[PDB]
Structure formats: structure tokens, C-alpha cells
Amino acid sequence: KLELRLKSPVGAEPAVYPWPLPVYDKHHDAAHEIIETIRWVCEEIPDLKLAMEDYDTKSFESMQRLCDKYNRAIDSIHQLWKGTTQPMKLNTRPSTGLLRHILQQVYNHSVTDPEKLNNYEPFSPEVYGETSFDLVAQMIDEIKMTDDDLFVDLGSGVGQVVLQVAAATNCKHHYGVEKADIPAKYAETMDREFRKWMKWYGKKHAEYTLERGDFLSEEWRERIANTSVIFVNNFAFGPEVDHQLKERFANMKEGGRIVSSKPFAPLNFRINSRNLSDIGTIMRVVELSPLKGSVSWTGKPVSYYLHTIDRTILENYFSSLKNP
Numbered sequence: 001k002l003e004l005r006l007k008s009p010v011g012a013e014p015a016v017y018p019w020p021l022p023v024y025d026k027h028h029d030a031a032h033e034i035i036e037t038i039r040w041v042c043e044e045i046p047d048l049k050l051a052m053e054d055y056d057t058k059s060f061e062s063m064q065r066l067c068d069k070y071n072r073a074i075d076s077i078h079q080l081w082k083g084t085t086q087p088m089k090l091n092t093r094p095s096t097g098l099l100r101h102i103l104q105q106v107y108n109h110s111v112t113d114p115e116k117l118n119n120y121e122p123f124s125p126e127v128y129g130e131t132s133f134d135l136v137a138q139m140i141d142e143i144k145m146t147d148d149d150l151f152v153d154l155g156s157g158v159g160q161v162v163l164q165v166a167a168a169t170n171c172k173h174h175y176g177v178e179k180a181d182i183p184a185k186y187a188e189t190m191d192r193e194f195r196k197w198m199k200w201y202g203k204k205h206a207e208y209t210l211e212r213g214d215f216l217s218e219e220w221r222e223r224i225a226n227t228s229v230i231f232v233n234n235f236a237f238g239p240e241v242d243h244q245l246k247e248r249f250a251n252m253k254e255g256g257r258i259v260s261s262k263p264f265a266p267l268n269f270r271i272n273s274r275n276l277s278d279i280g281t282i283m284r285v286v287e288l289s290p291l292k293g294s295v296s297w298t299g300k301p302v303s304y305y306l307h308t309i310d311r312t313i314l315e316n317y318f319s320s321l322k323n324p
């Protein structure tokens, strides 16, 4: 059995690839994953980049040559580290660039038949759609979580939002919960592959768990109440599900935040006597800045919304009713 092997820069088990190298979709294949993996390890380690500084992706010999060259360079670096040279700092977070490649790699090794994710009932709250790496990167940059925070993706799909946030932030725990069998099944493999690849690159992530469950269940009422940052792609959920979610958000703590693809209260909410029980009485809503040149299917640019629990809105309304 012909095989390509890439040694780990930190001495984990080598990544092994069968030949012929498989294709993942029209734009991704294992041959270019190998090449980009070498490239990224070269970014992690300058001396390796230096040692690397005629790739026919369809020729075995030629790809084996690339692999052996990387593998020989990894051995020499490992020897440098037994000398006076300081070994790669371990347990750091991956850069944004590396993380994107890791998630791509993890997805392609896990989501073995992507078409199966489109076998949901259409026009139902089970409609599946993936939030892009770039949006999640923006949210990470703009929300700024600390180790006091708990992060939950409600309806986590195959789990890639949770993996990215877990790789990038120091929340005490990250959760995803997903109800449908197909994506939750894939989420099990995403999880294993993410832990494997992260050890392989020698990078740390914060604690996370991917769960099969229904986030409208009784168990999930208290969990939502105690969550400080909720991510929820509720674009296709519909009004009954969003209403139920509103009822659960009303128990969140001051300063709790929800990032969503459809707003849970209007942006122009003015508290008055008719709307006293509406969820807009206890939260600020703002529209996150669109990322430059990102059109949605509607033609307008992709739109996400940040909600912050803030009951001073309601307290101020009540004091107002005492003072003309």
C-alpha cells in the first residue's frame, strides 16, 4: 500500500495519507492539504521555513519527494532543539491563518459526504447553513471574551463555530448543542479530528464539548440563563422558535450577550406602555459592521446582530414614569 507521511513538528503521530490522494470537493483535495500543511508548519517554525526556502500534485514520486524533504527538515529541527536552540513554544493558540487551515483540514477529514448535510426538511426550523470562518473571526475580535465567560452555539451543526472560538479565546468552557442526527454524528468526528490535528501542530484550545440535544428542553433553560455569550444562527428558525428563545434569554444575567443572524428585538425599540413585557425592554441591539465585499443571497451584505442584556433601559423607563 503506497502512502505519504508527514511527521509532526512536536513529535505526535505522523499524519498518514493513502495514495492516490483523495479529493474532498471541486476546490479541495488531499494533495493541496499536504502542501498547505507543510507551508503552515513552516510559519510555526522559522528554521524549518529556512530549510525549505517541481511539485506535480498528480505524481506520487514528486509528492513523496516533497514529503521526505519536509520530514528530513523536521528531523534536523528536532536535533537543533536537543542543542542550544529553544524548542517551539508549546501550548500557544494558533494564528488566525493557521486556524483557518486547521478547520478546513478537520472539516474535510470529518464531513465525508457534505451533500448529506442538505438532507433536512426545507422551510423548517432544521434548515442547515454554515456561518463563515470570517464572520466568526469578526465576532471573536469584537466581543472579547475572558475566562469568566461561557460560550454556547445554539444549533451548533457540525460544530465548527465552537471549535474556532475554542481555539481563539480563553472562555472557561465552550459548548455546542445540535438536534439533528446527521450533523451531530459528523460533530463527533469533527471533535476527534480537531483534538488530533491540534496536538499534531502543537497548539492549544480552551475546553469545549459538542453535544447532541434540543436547546428548547427543560435542561437547557437554566444552561441558557447561566451562559454569558450565546451564538445562534437563527436565520431559518422562524417566529415560534425565536419566541421560545426570547423566553429563555429573559433569564440571562446583566451584560450577557447574544450574537445572531436575525435580531430578537427591533433596532429602533422605544419602550412604552404597550410593549412593557417585550424582550427589547431588557437588551441593547446593534448590527455588527459588515465585512467588506461580502454579499448575502439577498444581494445586500451578510448581517449579524449583537444583543446585550441591559435592564437599566427598563429601570429608566420606570423612573421616568415618576418624574415629568
Ligand SMILES: Nc1ncnc2c1c(Br)cn2[C@@H]1O[C@H](CSCC[C@H](N)C(=O)O)[C@@H](O)[C@H]1O
Pocket (backbone or CB within 6 Å): 125, 126, 127, 128, 129, 130, 131, 132, 153, 154, 155, 156, 157, 158, 161, 177, 178, 179, 180, 183, 213, 214, 215, 216, 233, 237, 241
Ligand atoms: N431546538 C434545537 N436544538 C438543537 N439544534 C437545533 C434546534 C433547532 Br429549532 C434547530 N437546530 C439546529 O440549528 C442548526 C442551524 S444551522 C447553523 C450551524 C452552525 N451553528 C453555524 O452557524 O455554522 C441546524 O443544524 C439545526 O439542526
